[PDB]
Amino acid sequence: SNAGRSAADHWVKDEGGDSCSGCSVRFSLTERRHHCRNCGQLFCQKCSRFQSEIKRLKISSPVRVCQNCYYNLQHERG
Numbered sequence: 001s002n003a004g005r006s007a008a009d010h011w012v013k014d015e016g017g018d019s020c021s022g023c024s025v026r027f028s029l030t031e032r033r034h035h036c037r038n039c040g041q042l043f044c045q046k047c048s049r050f051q052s053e054i055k056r057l058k059i060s061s062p063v064r065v066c067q068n069c070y071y072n073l074q075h076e077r078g
């Protein structure tokens with residue numbers, strides 16, 4: 001007993017290679033790209049606009065992380 005998933009307004013889907021995940025904006029010389037080492041998705045400099053390590057992922061070194069992650073990475077201590 002399972003179910004599928006989809007939307008009501010989506011005539012395309014290929015945001016997995018060189019396009020933001022929270023914007024789908026095709027990365028370019030003006031749009032920086034970064035694959036979140038926490039989730040594994042590519043976001044734009046305007047999406048995450050942050051940078052830090054991911055202790056939750058056994059990462060002590062500072063890497064690219066989405067805002068959703070960064071916010072939790074800073075409040076991880078408290």
Ligand SMILES: [Zn+2]
Binds near residue numbers: 020046
């Ligand atoms: Zn974005």
Ligand SMILES: [Zn+2]
Binds near residue numbers: 037038039066068
């Ligand atoms: Zn993330």
